[PDB]
Tab-separated table of C-alpha atoms and ligand atoms in Angstrom:
chain	number	residue	atom	x	y	z
Y	1	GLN	CA	-0.053	-0.053	-0.018
Y	2	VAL	CA	2.863	2.328	0.194
Y	3	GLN	CA	3.275	4.544	-2.935
Y	4	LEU	CA	6.140	7.232	-3.266
Y	5	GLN	CA	6.045	10.162	-5.917
Y	6	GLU	CA	8.707	12.333	-7.391
Y	7	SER	CA	8.069	15.802	-8.398
Y	8	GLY	CA	10.600	18.358	-9.540
Y	9	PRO	CA	11.552	20.332	-12.478
Y	10	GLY	CA	12.224	18.372	-16.098
Y	11	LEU	CA	15.089	20.804	-17.211
Y	12	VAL	CA	17.967	22.816	-15.113
Y	13	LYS	CA	20.375	24.814	-16.407
Y	14	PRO	CA	24.496	23.772	-15.481
Y	15	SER	CA	26.051	25.183	-12.366
Y	16	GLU	CA	21.889	25.286	-10.885
Y	17	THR	CA	20.773	23.619	-7.673
Y	18	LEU	CA	18.491	20.967	-8.456
Y	19	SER	CA	15.456	20.168	-6.003
Y	20	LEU	CA	13.408	17.004	-5.924
Y	21	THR	CA	10.640	16.049	-3.646
Y	22	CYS	CA	9.210	12.741	-2.818
Y	23	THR	CA	5.698	12.323	-1.364
Y	24	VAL	CA	4.604	9.150	0.312
Y	25	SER	CA	1.199	7.298	0.652
Y	26	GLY	CA	0.083	4.920	2.800
Y	27	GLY	CA	3.194	4.968	5.154
Y	28	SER	CA	4.837	7.733	7.381
Y	29	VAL	CA	8.175	9.009	7.016
Y	30	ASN	CA	8.054	9.572	11.044
Y	31	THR	CA	7.591	5.956	11.850
Y	32	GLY	CA	9.233	2.506	11.403
Y	33	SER	CA	12.753	0.818	10.546
Y	34	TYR	CA	12.863	2.768	7.371
Y	35	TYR	CA	15.298	5.169	5.618
Y	36	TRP	CA	14.122	7.488	2.874
Y	37	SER	CA	16.505	7.108	-0.219
Y	38	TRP	CA	17.242	8.527	-3.735
Y	39	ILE	CA	18.566	6.774	-6.560
Y	40	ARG	CA	19.256	8.123	-10.285
Y	41	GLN	CA	19.518	6.242	-13.758
Y	42	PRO	CA	21.229	8.300	-16.265
Y	43	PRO	CA	19.283	7.480	-19.837
Y	44	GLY	CA	20.239	4.176	-21.239
Y	45	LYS	CA	22.424	3.452	-18.034
Y	46	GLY	CA	22.303	1.566	-14.595
Y	47	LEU	CA	21.024	2.704	-11.247
Y	48	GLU	CA	23.072	4.707	-8.784
Y	49	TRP	CA	22.315	5.208	-5.300
Y	50	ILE	CA	22.570	8.601	-4.007
Y	51	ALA	CA	21.663	9.029	-0.381
Y	52	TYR	CA	19.234	7.894	2.495
Y	53	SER	CA	18.082	9.613	5.672
Y	54	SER	CA	15.801	9.245	8.544
Y	55	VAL	CA	13.618	11.975	10.348
Y	56	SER	CA	16.109	11.559	13.232
Y	57	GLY	CA	18.885	13.036	11.288
Y	58	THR	CA	20.854	9.693	10.816
Y	59	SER	CA	21.677	10.207	6.772
Y	60	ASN	CA	24.273	8.056	4.582
Y	61	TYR	CA	25.833	9.355	1.260
Y	62	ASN	CA	27.143	7.862	-1.790
Y	63	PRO	CA	30.934	9.000	-1.339
Y	64	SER	CA	31.474	10.631	-4.817
Y	65	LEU	CA	28.071	12.879	-4.222
Y	66	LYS	CA	28.369	13.401	-0.473
Y	67	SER	CA	29.673	17.055	-0.494
Y	68	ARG	CA	26.759	18.078	-3.356
Y	69	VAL	CA	24.110	16.845	-1.711
Y	70	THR	CA	21.398	17.678	0.955
Y	71	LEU	CA	18.380	15.462	2.280
Y	72	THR	CA	15.598	16.784	4.585
Y	73	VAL	CA	12.752	14.860	5.750
Y	74	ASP	CA	9.353	16.805	6.293
Y	75	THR	CA	7.024	14.940	8.496
Y	76	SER	CA	4.221	17.694	8.267
Y	77	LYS	CA	3.643	17.040	4.804
Y	78	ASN	CA	4.958	13.212	4.761
Y	79	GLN	CA	7.720	14.174	2.201
Y	80	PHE	CA	11.464	14.061	1.811
Y	81	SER	CA	13.402	16.270	-0.404
Y	82	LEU	CA	17.019	16.255	-2.184
Y	83	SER	CA	19.293	18.764	-3.305
Y	84	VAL	CA	22.070	18.632	-5.710
Y	85	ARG	CA	24.413	21.481	-5.852
Y	86	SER	CA	26.190	22.788	-9.013
Y	87	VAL	CA	24.875	20.391	-11.601
Y	88	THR	CA	26.375	19.428	-15.096
Y	89	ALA	CA	25.365	17.384	-17.821
Y	90	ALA	CA	26.789	14.346	-15.863
Y	91	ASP	CA	23.588	14.821	-13.344
Y	92	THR	CA	20.958	14.364	-16.321
Y	93	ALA	CA	18.827	11.198	-15.112
Y	94	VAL	CA	15.624	9.900	-14.015
Y	95	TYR	CA	15.729	10.346	-10.219
Y	96	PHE	CA	13.798	7.945	-8.249
Y	97	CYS	CA	12.728	8.094	-4.531
Y	98	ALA	CA	12.562	4.590	-2.497
Y	99	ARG	CA	11.652	3.110	0.706
Y	100	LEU	CA	14.791	1.414	2.272
Y	101	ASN	CA	13.726	-1.166	4.851
Y	102	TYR	CA	15.713	-2.739	7.520
Y	103	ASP	CA	14.301	-6.294	7.876
Y	104	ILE	CA	14.647	-7.512	11.485
Y	105	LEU	CA	14.218	-11.120	10.440
Y	106	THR	CA	17.337	-11.033	8.507
Y	107	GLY	CA	19.298	-8.076	9.199
Y	108	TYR	CA	19.109	-7.115	5.778
Y	109	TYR	CA	18.862	-3.958	4.158
Y	110	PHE	CA	16.564	-3.455	0.822
Y	111	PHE	CA	14.610	-0.889	-1.064
Y	112	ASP	CA	11.035	-2.567	-0.875
Y	113	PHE	CA	8.882	0.208	-2.737
Y	114	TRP	CA	9.903	2.665	-5.311
Y	115	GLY	CA	8.784	5.585	-6.831
Y	116	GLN	CA	8.148	6.125	-10.737
Y	117	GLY	CA	11.073	8.312	-11.281
Y	118	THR	CA	11.076	12.031	-12.756
Y	119	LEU	CA	13.164	12.908	-15.630
Y	120	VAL	CA	15.524	15.688	-15.071
Y	121	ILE	CA	17.594	17.037	-18.010
Y	122	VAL	CA	20.603	19.361	-17.224
Y	123	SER	CA	21.148	21.746	-20.015
Y	124	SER	CA	22.058	25.140	-21.571
Y	125	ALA	CA	19.535	24.599	-24.075
Y	126	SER	CA	16.293	26.478	-23.704
Y	127	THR	CA	12.909	24.848	-23.407
Y	128	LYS	CA	10.842	24.859	-26.416
Y	129	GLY	CA	6.945	24.250	-26.084
Y	130	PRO	CA	5.536	22.077	-28.876
Y	131	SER	CA	3.409	23.365	-31.624
Y	132	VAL	CA	-0.102	20.843	-31.795
Y	133	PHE	CA	-1.474	20.042	-34.910
Y	134	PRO	CA	-4.556	17.665	-35.580
Y	135	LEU	CA	-4.201	14.579	-37.855
Y	136	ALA	CA	-7.030	13.779	-40.322
Y	137	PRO	CA	-6.823	10.948	-42.066
Y	138	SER	CA	-7.235	10.597	-46.016
Y	139	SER	CA	-10.765	9.295	-47.197
Y	140	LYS	CA	-8.799	6.225	-48.442
Y	141	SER	CA	-7.389	5.128	-45.251
Y	142	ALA	CA	-10.940	5.636	-43.679
Y	143	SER	CA	-12.912	3.701	-46.496
Y	144	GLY	CA	-12.302	0.312	-44.314
Y	145	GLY	CA	-14.862	1.442	-41.453
Y	146	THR	CA	-12.512	2.548	-39.043
Y	147	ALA	CA	-9.940	5.436	-39.224
Y	148	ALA	CA	-7.207	7.208	-37.544
Y	149	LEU	CA	-7.587	10.708	-35.923
Y	150	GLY	CA	-4.608	12.354	-33.894
Y	151	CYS	CA	-2.637	14.910	-32.718
Y	152	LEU	CA	1.105	16.046	-33.962
Y	153	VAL	CA	2.891	17.592	-31.192
Y	154	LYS	CA	5.833	18.990	-33.178
Y	155	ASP	CA	9.336	20.586	-32.476
Y	156	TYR	CA	9.706	20.584	-28.648
Y	157	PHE	CA	12.698	20.233	-25.805
Y	158	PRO	CA	13.014	18.643	-23.642
Y	159	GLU	CA	11.229	15.242	-22.998
Y	160	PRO	CA	8.630	14.301	-21.863
Y	161	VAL	CA	5.026	15.432	-23.134
Y	162	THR	CA	1.950	13.780	-21.692
Y	163	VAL	CA	-0.926	13.041	-24.105
Y	164	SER	CA	-4.550	11.968	-23.015
Y	165	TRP	CA	-7.615	12.287	-25.088
Y	166	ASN	CA	-10.995	13.816	-23.734
Y	167	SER	CA	-9.112	14.702	-20.496
Y	168	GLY	CA	-8.600	10.761	-20.001
Y	169	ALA	CA	-12.374	9.604	-20.399
Y	170	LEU	CA	-11.240	8.012	-24.047
Y	171	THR	CA	-8.581	5.512	-23.496
Y	172	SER	CA	-9.324	2.508	-25.811
Y	173	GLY	CA	-8.158	2.677	-29.532
Y	174	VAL	CA	-5.797	5.226	-28.341
Y	175	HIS	CA	-1.935	4.819	-29.204
Y	176	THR	CA	0.792	7.555	-28.128
Y	177	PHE	CA	4.046	6.770	-29.948
Y	178	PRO	CA	7.703	7.337	-28.817
Y	179	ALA	CA	9.036	10.585	-29.810
Y	180	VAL	CA	11.446	11.296	-32.806
Y	181	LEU	CA	14.633	13.521	-31.996
Y	182	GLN	CA	15.357	15.217	-34.977
Y	183	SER	CA	18.559	16.577	-36.393
Y	184	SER	CA	17.424	20.089	-34.951
Y	185	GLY	CA	17.688	18.695	-31.320
Y	186	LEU	CA	13.862	19.364	-30.994
Y	187	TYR	CA	11.354	16.333	-30.370
Y	188	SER	CA	7.938	15.405	-32.062
Y	189	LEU	CA	5.468	12.874	-31.242
Y	190	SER	CA	2.200	11.796	-32.523
Y	191	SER	CA	-0.680	10.306	-30.793
Y	192	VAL	CA	-4.039	8.815	-32.379
Y	193	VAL	CA	-7.276	7.515	-31.762
Y	194	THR	CA	-9.206	4.755	-33.767
Y	195	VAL	CA	-12.712	5.820	-34.249
Y	196	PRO	CA	-15.645	4.247	-36.208
Y	197	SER	CA	-15.947	5.772	-39.828
Y	198	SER	CA	-19.327	5.736	-39.178
Y	199	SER	CA	-21.314	8.887	-37.935
Y	200	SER	CA	-18.436	10.318	-35.875
Y	201	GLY	CA	-20.118	13.988	-36.003
Y	202	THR	CA	-21.808	12.641	-33.008
Y	203	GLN	CA	-18.313	12.762	-31.167
Y	204	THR	CA	-15.914	14.703	-29.554
Y	205	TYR	CA	-12.032	14.454	-29.872
Y	206	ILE	CA	-9.962	16.461	-27.877
Y	207	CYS	CA	-6.071	15.723	-27.284
Y	208	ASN	CA	-4.854	17.150	-23.959
Y	209	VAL	CA	-1.116	18.099	-24.410
Y	210	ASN	CA	1.040	18.832	-21.330
Y	211	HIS	CA	4.801	19.909	-21.788
Y	212	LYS	CA	5.596	21.084	-18.036
Y	213	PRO	CA	9.205	22.414	-18.771
Y	214	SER	CA	7.550	24.887	-21.016
Y	215	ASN	CA	4.199	25.239	-19.286
Y	216	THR	CA	2.817	24.383	-22.419
Y	217	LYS	CA	-0.505	23.018	-21.548
Y	218	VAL	CA	-3.176	22.606	-24.227
Y	219	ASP	CA	-6.274	20.825	-25.336
Y	220	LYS	CA	-6.921	20.784	-29.159
Y	221	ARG	CA	-10.213	19.697	-30.768
Y	222	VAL	CA	-9.663	17.361	-33.482
Y	223	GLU	CA	-12.441	17.591	-36.150
Y	224	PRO	CA	-14.155	14.120	-37.009
Y	225	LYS	CA	-13.569	14.292	-40.633
Y	226	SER	CA	-11.054	13.583	-43.155
Y	227	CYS	CA	-8.451	15.590	-44.865
Y	228	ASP	CA	-11.165	16.548	-47.268
Y	229	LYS	CA	-13.173	19.126	-45.313
Y	230	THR	CA	-15.814	19.564	-48.071
Y	231	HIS	CA	-16.958	16.478	-48.414
Y	232	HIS	CA	-20.376	16.714	-46.824
Y	233	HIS	CA	-20.872	19.679	-49.466
Y	234	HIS	CA	-19.573	18.605	-52.490
Y	235	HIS	CA	-20.222	14.923	-52.369
Y	236	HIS	CA	-17.518	14.125	-54.152
Y	237	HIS	CA	-15.186	10.891	-53.820
Y	238	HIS	CA	-11.549	11.470	-53.079
M	1	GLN	CA	34.015	-1.554	-1.008
M	2	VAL	CA	31.738	-4.185	-2.194
M	3	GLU	CA	30.783	-4.575	-5.604
M	4	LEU	CA	28.470	-6.210	-7.608
M	5	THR	CA	29.505	-7.590	-11.339
M	6	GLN	CA	26.707	-8.444	-13.690
M	7	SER	CA	26.777	-9.354	-17.244
M	8	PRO	CA	24.697	-6.600	-19.126
M	9	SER	CA	22.530	-8.927	-21.463
M	10	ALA	CA	20.760	-12.247	-21.443
M	11	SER	CA	17.975	-13.751	-23.441
M	12	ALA	CA	16.245	-16.862	-23.786
M	13	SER	CA	12.910	-18.201	-24.935
M	14	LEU	CA	9.330	-18.146	-23.536
M	15	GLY	CA	8.226	-21.141	-21.497
M	16	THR	CA	11.763	-22.220	-20.576
M	17	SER	CA	13.824	-21.378	-17.169
M	18	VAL	CA	16.396	-18.439	-17.328
M	19	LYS	CA	19.059	-18.024	-14.409
M	20	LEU	CA	20.715	-14.648	-14.172
M	21	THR	CA	24.027	-14.224	-12.160
M	22	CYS	CA	25.754	-11.477	-10.129
M	23	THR	CA	28.610	-11.840	-8.751
M	24	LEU	CA	30.315	-10.508	-5.395
M	25	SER	CA	33.284	-8.749	-5.179
M	26	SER	CA	37.009	-10.378	-3.624
M	27	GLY	CA	36.127	-10.778	0.285
M	28	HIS	CA	32.397	-10.125	0.173
M	29	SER	CA	31.410	-13.806	-0.805
M	30	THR	CA	29.558	-13.788	2.136
M	31	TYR	CA	27.115	-11.079	1.477
M	32	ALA	CA	23.244	-11.520	1.015
M	33	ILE	CA	21.603	-9.582	-1.958
M	34	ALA	CA	18.248	-8.296	-3.086
M	35	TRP	CA	17.226	-8.489	-6.743
M	36	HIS	CA	14.991	-5.659	-8.202
M	37	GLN	CA	13.191	-5.899	-11.781
M	38	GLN	CA	12.559	-2.611	-13.858
M	39	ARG	CA	10.385	-3.152	-16.725
M	40	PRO	CA	10.399	-0.357	-19.837
M	41	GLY	CA	9.589	3.229	-18.672
M	42	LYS	CA	8.919	1.743	-15.113
M	43	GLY	CA	10.611	2.492	-11.593
M	44	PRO	CA	12.133	-0.706	-10.256
M	45	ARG	CA	10.071	-3.509	-8.714
M	46	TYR	CA	11.675	-5.094	-5.293
M	47	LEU	CA	11.682	-8.803	-6.421
M	48	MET	CA	13.052	-10.718	-3.139
M	49	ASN	CA	16.217	-10.966	-0.680
M	50	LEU	CA	19.009	-13.686	-0.904
M	51	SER	CA	21.470	-15.382	1.436
M	52	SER	CA	24.857	-16.407	0.685
M	53	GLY	CA	23.660	-19.866	1.510
M	54	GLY	CA	20.821	-19.632	-1.192
M	55	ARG	CA	17.527	-18.950	0.737
M	56	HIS	CA	15.649	-16.501	-0.637
M	57	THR	CA	12.441	-14.450	0.604
M	58	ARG	CA	10.103	-13.239	-1.902
M	59	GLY	CA	8.513	-9.502	-1.797
M	60	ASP	CA	4.765	-9.119	-1.459
M	61	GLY	CA	2.881	-9.792	-4.811
M	62	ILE	CA	5.856	-11.286	-6.406
M	63	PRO	CA	4.840	-14.727	-8.399
M	64	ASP	CA	6.304	-18.131	-7.126
M	65	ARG	CA	8.100	-18.826	-10.454
M	66	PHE	CA	10.718	-15.934	-8.966
M	67	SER	CA	13.409	-17.866	-6.852
M	68	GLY	CA	16.949	-17.129	-5.999
M	69	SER	CA	20.104	-19.545	-5.195
M	70	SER	CA	23.581	-19.347	-4.479
M	71	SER	CA	27.097	-20.735	-5.183
M	72	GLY	CA	30.191	-18.942	-3.472
M	73	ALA	CA	30.394	-15.533	-4.489
M	74	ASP	CA	27.799	-16.020	-6.938
M	75	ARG	CA	24.057	-14.981	-6.703
M	76	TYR	CA	21.502	-16.469	-8.716
M	77	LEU	CA	17.855	-15.303	-9.989
M	78	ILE	CA	15.771	-18.196	-11.662
M	79	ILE	CA	12.793	-17.431	-13.600
M	80	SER	CA	10.780	-20.504	-14.011
M	81	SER	CA	8.833	-20.488	-16.799
M	82	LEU	CA	9.725	-17.084	-18.646
M	83	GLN	CA	6.700	-14.990	-19.644
M	84	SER	CA	6.411	-12.153	-21.813
M	85	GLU	CA	6.210	-9.753	-19.115
M	86	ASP	CA	9.618	-10.727	-17.556
M	87	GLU	CA	11.504	-8.724	-20.284
M	88	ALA	CA	12.954	-6.344	-18.383
M	89	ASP	CA	16.344	-5.223	-16.778
M	90	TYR	CA	17.214	-6.960	-13.752
M	91	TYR	CA	19.524	-5.266	-11.131
M	92	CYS	CA	21.041	-6.917	-7.727
M	93	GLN	CA	21.562	-4.675	-4.603
M	94	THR	CA	23.718	-5.188	-1.326
M	95	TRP	CA	24.854	-2.757	1.346
M	96	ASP	CA	28.297	-2.087	2.974
M	97	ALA	CA	29.195	1.375	3.938
M	98	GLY	CA	26.389	2.424	1.686
M	99	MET	CA	24.104	0.952	-0.599
M	100	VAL	CA	25.517	-0.568	-3.721
M	101	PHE	CA	23.871	-1.908	-6.908
M	102	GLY	CA	25.149	-4.076	-9.865
M	103	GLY	CA	25.433	-2.787	-13.122
M	104	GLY	CA	22.032	-4.338	-14.230
M	105	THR	CA	21.160	-7.330	-17.061
M	106	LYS	CA	18.778	-6.328	-19.713
M	107	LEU	CA	16.690	-9.776	-20.238
M	108	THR	CA	15.225	-10.401	-23.744
M	109	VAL	CA	12.574	-12.522	-24.058
M	110	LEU	CA	12.182	-14.415	-27.204
M	111	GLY	CA	9.766	-16.858	-29.442
M	112	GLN	CA	6.635	-14.685	-30.011
M	113	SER	CA	5.010	-14.905	-33.369
M	114	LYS	CA	6.494	-12.744	-36.211
M	115	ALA	CA	3.815	-9.997	-37.557
M	116	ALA	CA	4.121	-7.728	-40.074
M	117	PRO	CA	4.063	-3.949	-39.890
M	118	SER	CA	0.688	-2.195	-40.261
M	119	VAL	CA	1.230	1.528	-41.625
M	120	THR	CA	-0.744	4.678	-41.352
M	121	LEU	CA	0.318	7.924	-43.389
M	122	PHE	CA	-0.904	11.340	-42.625
M	123	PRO	CA	-0.968	14.301	-45.193
M	124	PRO	CA	-0.096	17.845	-43.468
M	125	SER	CA	-2.778	19.409	-41.588
M	126	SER	CA	-4.387	22.741	-43.279
M	127	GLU	CA	-3.387	24.294	-39.629
M	128	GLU	CA	0.245	23.592	-40.323
M	129	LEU	CA	0.087	24.473	-44.009
M	130	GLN	CA	-1.396	27.808	-42.985
M	131	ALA	CA	1.759	28.110	-40.694
M	132	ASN	CA	3.755	27.773	-43.956
M	133	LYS	CA	5.140	24.250	-42.750
M	134	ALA	CA	4.198	20.600	-43.908
M	135	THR	CA	4.836	17.215	-42.287
M	136	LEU	CA	3.949	13.854	-43.196
M	137	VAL	CA	3.643	11.330	-40.717
M	138	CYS	CA	3.963	7.863	-41.207
M	139	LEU	CA	3.017	5.299	-38.050
M	140	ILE	CA	4.270	1.932	-38.047
M	141	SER	CA	2.693	-0.408	-35.586
M	142	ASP	CA	2.447	-3.744	-34.091
M	143	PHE	CA	5.469	-5.589	-35.770
M	144	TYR	CA	8.123	-8.132	-34.706
M	145	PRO	CA	10.898	-8.624	-34.885
M	146	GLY	CA	11.908	-4.952	-34.137
M	147	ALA	CA	14.047	-3.919	-37.414
M	148	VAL	CA	12.630	-2.062	-39.918
M	149	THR	CA	13.683	0.312	-43.193
M	150	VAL	CA	11.565	3.234	-44.134
M	151	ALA	CA	12.034	4.746	-47.600
M	152	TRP	CA	10.124	7.992	-48.608
M	153	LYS	CA	8.847	8.959	-52.379
M	154	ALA	CA	8.105	11.771	-54.092
M	155	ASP	CA	5.846	10.508	-56.800
M	156	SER	CA	8.314	7.820	-57.578
M	157	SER	CA	11.653	9.437	-56.866
M	158	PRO	CA	13.044	8.729	-53.664
M	159	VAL	CA	13.254	11.376	-50.881
M	160	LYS	CA	16.193	11.493	-48.245
M	161	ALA	CA	16.021	15.335	-47.064
M	162	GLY	CA	13.758	15.894	-44.449
M	163	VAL	CA	13.188	12.165	-43.280
M	164	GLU	CA	13.501	11.577	-39.252
M	165	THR	CA	12.607	7.958	-38.019
M	166	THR	CA	12.480	6.594	-34.612
M	167	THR	CA	14.157	3.414	-33.599
M	168	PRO	CA	11.271	0.713	-32.956
M	169	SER	CA	10.647	0.404	-29.153
M	170	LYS	CA	7.973	-2.190	-27.768
M	171	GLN	CA	4.563	-1.086	-26.871
M	172	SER	CA	2.245	-2.166	-24.334
M	173	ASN	CA	0.805	-5.346	-26.623
M	174	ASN	CA	4.480	-6.428	-26.602
M	175	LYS	CA	4.997	-5.119	-30.383
M	176	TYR	CA	7.241	-2.883	-31.792
M	177	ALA	CA	6.258	0.571	-33.153
M	178	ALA	CA	7.996	3.236	-34.933
M	179	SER	CA	7.524	6.667	-36.570
M	180	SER	CA	8.835	8.565	-39.735
M	181	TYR	CA	8.339	12.323	-40.365
M	182	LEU	CA	9.104	13.592	-43.783
M	183	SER	CA	9.422	17.651	-43.441
M	184	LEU	CA	8.435	19.627	-46.853
M	185	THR	CA	7.225	23.302	-47.734
M	186	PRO	CA	3.842	23.691	-48.589
M	187	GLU	CA	4.882	24.271	-52.240
M	188	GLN	CA	6.820	20.613	-52.199
M	189	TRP	CA	3.570	18.922	-51.058
M	190	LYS	CA	1.298	20.754	-53.677
M	191	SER	CA	4.037	20.457	-56.395
M	192	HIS	CA	3.973	16.608	-56.455
M	193	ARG	CA	1.178	14.152	-57.665
M	194	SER	CA	1.543	11.863	-54.594
M	195	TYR	CA	4.090	11.087	-51.484
M	196	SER	CA	4.743	7.425	-50.407
M	197	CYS	CA	5.838	6.054	-47.343
M	198	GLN	CA	7.138	2.247	-47.671
M	199	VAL	CA	8.066	0.326	-44.772
M	200	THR	CA	10.510	-3.080	-45.336
M	201	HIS	CA	10.172	-6.094	-42.820
M	202	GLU	CA	11.720	-9.256	-43.054
M	203	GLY	CA	12.358	-8.646	-46.768
M	204	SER	CA	8.477	-7.756	-47.416
M	205	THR	CA	7.299	-4.356	-47.898
M	206	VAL	CA	4.107	-2.259	-47.265
M	207	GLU	CA	3.615	1.121	-48.837
M	208	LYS	CA	0.987	3.988	-48.261
M	209	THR	CA	0.371	7.041	-50.368
M	210	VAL	CA	-1.007	10.354	-49.642
M	211	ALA	CA	-1.753	13.003	-52.204
M	212	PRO	CA	-2.489	16.900	-52.172
M	213	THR	CA	-5.632	16.366	-54.469
M	214	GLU	CA	-7.278	13.968	-51.844
M	215	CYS	CA	-7.508	16.897	-49.320
M	216	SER	CA	-9.512	20.080	-49.419
W	301	3FX	O1	26.887	3.422	-7.648
W	301	3FX	S1	26.306	2.677	-6.772
W	301	3FX	O2	26.463	0.904	-6.212
W	301	3FX	O3	24.912	2.407	-6.458
W	301	3FX	C1	26.561	3.754	-5.061
W	301	3FX	C2	28.166	3.304	-4.414
W	301	3FX	O4	28.436	4.389	-3.510
W	301	3FX	C3	29.240	3.426	-5.744
C-alpha cells in the first residue's frame, strides 16, 4: 500500500541547484525501521544510489556525491527532499525516491518500494513548447470502416510530453507513439485514436497535451473529418 | 568496498527457465543481496532478498516462478517459466558502507510470433500548412521482430532530405512501433502528384500513399 511519487523540474541549467521532493502515501516518514532514499539512472545506464536519511537525522551518502547533496525529511507533509548543488550534464538522469527497509528477521537492507521516477535534463538549451496540429486521415484510409484521428506534437524540448484524449475519458483505441529526436535537437511525437468511420459527427475528440518544462498545456479539438473537409457539401469521392 | 558484477545482457525463450547471475567482489562472498526488476519506462520493483547460503524470500505480490540460489560468490535469480512480461532489466543490490547496485542485466524474451507492420500515413494538416510548414507522418505499428527500414517517395523518386525516423521500441501489446516524419515546404507538398511511405520488414514491404488532391 506504500506509494512514493517524485516531483521536480524537468530541465535545469548547468551550475544550478536541483531540488526534488518525494511524497509518500500509505506510510509515514516519521515511524518505522525505514530510511528514505534517492537513486538515479542516466538514460540508457544503470541505477546509482545517491543518499538516504531518517527523520531522526541519521543520513548516509554515496561518497562521490556526499559534498554536493543535502537531504531533508518533512514529517508534517509526509515528504522528503533532495538537493544537488552545481549540476552539470553528468547529472542528467531519471531520479527515483525509494523506501529503504531494514528487515529485522534477516538483518538485511533493501529498497522494498520505489517511485515511478522523474526525468531531469541538465542543459544550457532553452525549453521549447510544442505546436499541436490535428492529424486528419485521407478518405481512402478511412474507407475500411475505421479511421485514425490524431494530434502531431511538433518541435519541443526536452522530453517528456503527456498526451491524453477527452481528459482521460477516452482510452480504448488510443496509441501514443514514442517521440523522434530530430537533427535540430527538437522532439516530435504523434498520438492517434481509432474511431468508427460511421457517424463521428456525434463525437468529440480533444487531445490534451502537457509539456511541463515550457508550461505548454493545450486542449486541441480534432474535427471528426477526413483531410477533405468539404465532402459533405460537394459529395465528391476522393 | 563491495562491488556487484552483472553481465549486461541475457536472452531466452518463452516457457523455459532462465538463470541470471550476480557476482560479489573479492572478500565479500558471504554477502546477502536483493533482486529488483525494472520494466521498460517504469520504476524498479523489489523481487526478493537472498542469503549467501541460497535462501530467498520473495517480496509481497511477487509470483512464485521467481526464486533465488547461490554458489560461492555468485548469486542467482531463477525465473521458472519465462513470460513475456519478464522482459526487463534486473539489478542486484547489497549494502556495506552504503547501498550498492550491480550494473544490471537486460533480459530479452524470445519466441513470440512474427508479425508484419501496419502502416498509417497522414497528409499535412491545413493548420500547419497555414503556418507555412508541412509534415507527413508515417506511423508503423504491431510488428515483430523490431527492425524496419523506411523509404519515402515523391511521386516515384526517392526522398532522403527531411526524413526523421525513430528506433523501434516495444509497446504495451508487446509488439514494436516506430514513426517516420517527412518535412516539406507547402510548395513541395502541392507540387507533386503523391507522396509514399514504404516500410520493409523481414524482406517484405508495405506502402501507403497520400496526395494533395485527396485533401481540401
Ligand atoms: O553506484 S552505487 O553502487 O549504486 C553507490 C556506491 O556508493 C558506489
